[PDB]
Design a protein around this nucleic acid. Structure first.
Ligand SMILES: O=C(NCc1c(F)cc(F)cc1F)c1cn2c(c(O)c1=O)C(=O)N1[C@H]3CC[C@H](C3)O[C@@H]1C2
Ligand SMILES: [Cl-]
Ligand SMILES: [Mg+2]
Ligand SMILES: [Mg+2]
Ligand SMILES: [Zn+2]
Ligand SMILES: [Zn+2]
Ligand SMILES: [Zn+2]
Lengths: 270, 252, 48, 69, 47
DNA sequence: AACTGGTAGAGATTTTTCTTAGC
DNA sequence: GCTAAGAAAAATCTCTACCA
DNA sequence: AACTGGTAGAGATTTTTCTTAGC
DNA sequence: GCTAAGAAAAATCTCTACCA
């Protein structure tokens, strides 16, 4: 048997910190017991679970960051769904200039959600006042995790490579920054639709507005209520709006929630 | 198909419809409808901007307006020289597609710096809407003046209220929705024109019904899975693919 | 109701019917690029 | 009296085996591994943990969650 | 952890001679160690 | 003309093994 | 007596941080 | 209890298009 | 006249560094 082997394996791990394969082969205990002996140790457990998340890419979300180049401060904002860039040179990295940059951006484009890191200029009362007046939701990343703002750091890299490409055609750094913004937005193609970034932001915002107006006109003349049967218990839920009926399943709306129910579990009522 | 093409030709002969309406109504592709409009003798701007400078409280406000929609970009300059005007023009050309600029005969607008920026960014500059937009913007600035401390903050808050809060016109839209609709329509037209030229570099030899001789070289308009639309003798007609041979044409 | 209210109601209802049949196809001519679970590539153009 | 005690022990057994997890996480400027904490919420990409009566948000790439057998 | 459950299940079987599914359900240990606790007892037999 | 990324652990998915209900 | 469902336990596969 | 890596280019492999030899 | 081999040209897939 292996019960005395389990006691010996606990003493051996307390001294040497074996892994589970070493203990399961030396003391001939099963692998579940050796995995438990390692999992109940605090000096071990130094390793994460090896995955990546995905960031928010809604059609009115912007990310923002500050970078440095030749002793200057550049501030970059990116539209996430298209890749569209605005960038400027600041005299200092204070909160007043960041609030002025954000107010000009909100005066030019529709901004509803802003994502930043925890820098001192972004966690500021001036930026908070501008977000209150212009009705922007500001979210911050997990501290010391630059992967939360992945799009704007990727665009920091692209902006610096273009600036080294066209550096000898300008005198100052501010002219070179605006020339790089023009080259990125209108002279580079490839991506989702074979577009540039300017064509893609025009397509995304225009398609958003057109599709809301179309389904307003569609939903104002509807009929055909639907009673459907779902759940773990075969119950009956209330009045649902039929949206689309397909060969195989139907699409219903219940409580502003969209559901796809097969045709056997529903009945349409005029 | 051919019934829809003949109905679209009769309807354009009466009323001279546009190609988007004909493509939506008679259920034909868009390249065929564009060809129907292009064969008419009686049927044959989204990127022009106007700039101006004005004064307020001893400060210089520079205003650019998009003419087809009424869209506004404004700024507060430290002086009225040509270097700051050239920097404002370079920022505007970096954010929007600008091809034609209309100004007055001011000093800072007629300068070597503005000339160099227009050369690098490929803009056509012409010297002679902005005054009406300046008056409307200044009424908003005096309306929301006590909500801000400085003048640059009040200028940008008035630009936001003008662009996204005031609605009017035909359908009841703001200026930002109108500029995005205008530029999207122009983008659709240029992409379709690229497809039209790429298709029309071909040539078609077709074999008519109850004849064993191939006919003349007809130009290809549309190539489908089972149908082919060709132009021949100032006439459009539909031939199936089993009686057609498509060859490249080098007739530049 | 008077005569103008009746003629406006009748022609508006007729327009709503025929334009409904055209508008559904108009909303299904858009293209969607979506992302599934724990794969970092944008999948191809589904129909909205 | 006895039957209600049996049903209460069964329901408390299920509730005790639902969400008694331990979390070892990695945070700070110098990212060191810190001690156990209690899992509150687990979304895709990040977790919310309670440590020493302090709430923290950690990404799932910098944490390890230990269950019970 | 269930190693303290292993020690308590050994004491409980030394008193009352439980079966292995009972010890596995009561002390929350896997089934292999519970069958081993039954197997090392000379009076009992896993069945 | 003759050089070069790798290691080990955390979960997820698939395969093998073991007990027992049913004909 | 023999089969097979179902669950436990083991084996294989993909992906991550860190090493000046 | 409500958060999260991404972008763009260099080769390699597979698919579509175009001309011409042969029956 | 029709087919098909063969090569050119375009499209798709995998993998890397850099962003404080
Ligand atoms: O390490 C950085 N980038 C490189 C990088 C990346 F971009 C993306 C990756 F997946 C991996 C990477 F290694 C980086 C670090 N910090 C900040 C950045 O913006 C930043 O980009 C920042 O602003 N702060 C402020 C908030 C608190 C203080 C000042 O420290 C942080 C430090
Ligand atoms: Cl941070
Ligand atoms: Mg930063
Ligand atoms: Mg950064
Ligand atoms: Zn250990
Ligand atoms: Zn005409
Ligand atoms: Zn016994």
């Amino acid at each position: 048997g292996f019960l005395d082997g389990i006691e010996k394996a606990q003493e051996e791990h307390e001294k040497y910190h074996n892994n589970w394969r070493a203990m399961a082969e030396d003391f001939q205990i099963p692998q579940v017991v050796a995995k438990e002996i390692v999992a109940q140790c605090p000096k071990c457990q130094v390793k994460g679970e090896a995955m990546h998340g995905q960031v928010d890419a809604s059609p009115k979300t912007w990310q923002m960051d500050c970078t440095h180049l030749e002793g200057k401060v550049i501030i970059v904002a990116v539209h996430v769904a298209s890749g569209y860039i605005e960038a400027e040179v600041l005299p200092a990295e204070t909160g007043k200039e960041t609030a002025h940059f954000l107010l000009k951006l909100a005066a030019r484009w529709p901004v509803k959600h802003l994502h930043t890191d925890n820098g001192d200029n972004f966690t500021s009362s001036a930026v908070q006042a501008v977000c209150w007046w212009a009705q922007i939701e500001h979210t911050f990343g997990v501290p010391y995790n630059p992967q939360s703002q992945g799009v704007v750091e990727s665009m920091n890299h692209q902006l610096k490579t273009i600036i080294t490409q066209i550096r000898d055609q300008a005198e100052k750094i501010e002219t070179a920054v605006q020339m790089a913004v023009l080259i990125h937005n209108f002279k580079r193609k490839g991506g989702i639709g074979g577009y540039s970034a300017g064509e893609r932001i025009i397509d995304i915002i225009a398609s958003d507005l057109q599709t809301t107006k179309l389904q307003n006109q569609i939903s104002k003349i509807q009929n055909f209520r639907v009673y459907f049967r779902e759940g773990r218990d075969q119950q009956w839920k209330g009045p649902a709006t039929l949206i689309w009926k397909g060969e195989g399943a139907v699409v219903i709306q219940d409580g502003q929630d969209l559901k796809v129910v097969p045709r056997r579990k529903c009945k349409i009522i005029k």
